[PDB]
DNA sequence: TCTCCAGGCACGTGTCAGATATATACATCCTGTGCATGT
DNA sequence: ACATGCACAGGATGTATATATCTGACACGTGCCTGGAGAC
């Protein structure tokens, strides 16, 4: 999976460096289907993440954004 | 050089007070205006400010209509409540039933409201403005703010169609992006603001757009004199201010293009796509 | 008696305006409070689960 | 204000589980129930008064059902009723 | 003279629902007569139940009872 | 469409819909016009007038079916006052 | 007949399947109408 | 000279990704009370 996409392969390198730096990432997509695929990848490399897309209900939005902002364990949104 | 409307239970920053002025003049002289401060400079407070000024001096207390994105209504309602405590806001969102009751607050007989009215500012979404346009069209509005005015960037949008047909003296668009995409979408706003002076998109194209759109799209020469003449035409109707002048404290962004070649599978798919032509 | 009843009808009709105005104004205000007054949560279940886990931890056990 | 709604709903979700029924249709079905009730009960009462009895037993209800409902409808109705009364007696 | 408010088009539509291809022009006034006689019979009974109940308002049940009394049971009320 | 076909189309249109075929306010005014011959100043539940209308339209539609068969028996495709009266005659409404 | 309580009824509530427009781009289908050719 | 057929103009329709809103019907929770059930 991570090598069948050139972007994904390059994102992997960059996220490893970002993590080791203690950076926290908003990661933006134009396709929610891709948001799903990735969701997997992130599980494999075992990084903590949130999700907010047009499916995410309004008070759940508030909740998720507040998390990302409250609890620094989450690395990617 | 006006004074912070005294009905305003806060103090404006410098630029909001210069921006107040602009909107006070754009009224005295009949003009409308886009307030296009770059995103995050405090556009809401300047709008509420104009409305409060109106009241204090001209004793015109209503009705004012704020249309906004649905997501933003509570923020608007709270901001109005904070900055002009005396302003009775009427929320106008809710199920059909909720809205039906609220419609009973609309005084259609008084042309101009005074302090003890049912309501002063009505706050409502673009979606409602369009579904309930039947109702909104009967009312006659003393001022109107569209916030996140990029919502009516298309002249073919039902949203622009509806809102253009509202009887209102005064419109104030708020949007930090008058243009995004074509310049067409700037004509849309200009026509909404002042349909007299920008009465024809085609003229607009011929005289300004096709030059500027070719200078970007095909790297032609930019006609300096034409461009200056456009700015001129825009200048009394659009105010834009930028963070580097008024929110100086933030450090800059670093942008990095990160380049990737297709993997094998990607390529063999890309090329079947190309061969399907 | 008929005159008394006419007077009584004026009384009930006068009272109807006060009774209508009171309910209309109250229900108008209740709805503004229904919408603008608002903002809460629903993960109530999440909170309950957290409380249950805390209660389980409060118990020392060596089985 | 009592209606055989509840029960019409339980029967519906037993025979066509994912299908609903409209409020108007529920009204019509409730009227149907009331009408059939009335007819059967009344014929049963008549049979009782005609045989000088003063009680509407299972046997009155059976004969009412056989007079009222046509052919296969009558037969199947008799069957269901008999089955139900049998189960009741057993319990 | 409200009977002619039952319009020629209204009668035509009802004849169409009843499977009628062509309508002789004398039908319209017969249909009004027939309808008026029928309504009088139902309303007289409905009013009779209404009076008995010591009501001033005719209710849906009064009409349903009047129709059942005349062998034209109406389901739905 | 060739003549007579539009009629069969109209019949189909009216046989597939469930809408009421008499206008509501004309029928309501007829009900009140009849009612005041039996007792003056009668009030009606909104639903009572609709119950009368549904029954009345159902009656007329059923009568037109019987009327149609009377015409067709006489080797006609046109219904006439005679056909209504025979239908009413044999139904025992006379 | 004296006794009990739970099933059902009235009332809120909340949510989500199918529906209302659409920014973001562009290719495509459409057909009014004009021009050319043939009879 | 007139009529018919064939291709430009540029518009409306269309394809695809989520967004931004919404509405009404279904399901579920609450409160309570009367009538279905007990059994002598």
UniProtKB/TrEMBL annotation, chain C:
<feature type="coiled-coil region">
    <location>
        <begin position="1"/>
        <end position="26"/>
    </location>
</feature>
<feature type="compositionally biased region" description="Basic and acidic residues">
    <location>
        <begin position="55"/>
        <end position="63"/>
    </location>
</feature>
<feature type="compositionally biased region" description="Basic residues">
    <location>
        <begin position="32"/>
        <end position="41"/>
    </location>
</feature>
<feature type="domain" description="INO80 complex subunit B-like conserved region">
    <location>
        <begin position="1"/>
        <end position="63"/>
    </location>
</feature>
<feature type="region of interest" description="Disordered">
    <location>
        <begin position="32"/>
        <end position="63"/>
    </location>
</feature>
<protein>
    <recommendedName>
        <fullName>INO80 complex subunit B-like conserved region domain-containing protein</fullName>
    </recommendedName>
</protein>
